[PDB]
Amino acid sequence: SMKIDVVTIFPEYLQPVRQSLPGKAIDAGLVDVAVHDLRRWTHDVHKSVDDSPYGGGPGMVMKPTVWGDALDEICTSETLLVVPTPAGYPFTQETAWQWSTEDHLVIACGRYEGIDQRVADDAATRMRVREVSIGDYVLNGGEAAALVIIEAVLRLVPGVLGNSLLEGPSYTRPPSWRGMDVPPVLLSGDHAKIAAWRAEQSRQRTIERRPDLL
Ligand X SMILES: Nc1c(O)cccc1[N+](=O)[O-]
Phi, psi of 91 (to 5 degrees): -80, 120
> Is 50 within any annotated ligand binding site?
no
65 binds, among ligand X, its own copies, none (CB under 5 to 8 A by kind): its own copies
Rounded to whole angstroms, what are the CA distances from 78 to 7, 25, 108? 17, 23, 16
Q: Is 27 or 179 the residue whose CB approaches its own copies more closely? A: 179
The footprint of ligand X (CB under 6 A) covers 84-86, 133-135, 137-139, 141-142, 145
Question: Least distance in Å: CB of 138 to ligand X?
Answer: 4
- Establish whether 110 is an annotated binding residue: yes
Chosen from its own copies, ligand X, none, partner binding at 84 (C-beta under 5 to 8 Å by type): ligand X
Pairing status of strand 128-133 against strand 180-181: unpaired
Binding at 182: pick from its own copies, ligand X, none (beta carbon under 5-8 Å per type): its own copies
**Per the annotation, where are the binding residues?**
84, 110, 133-139
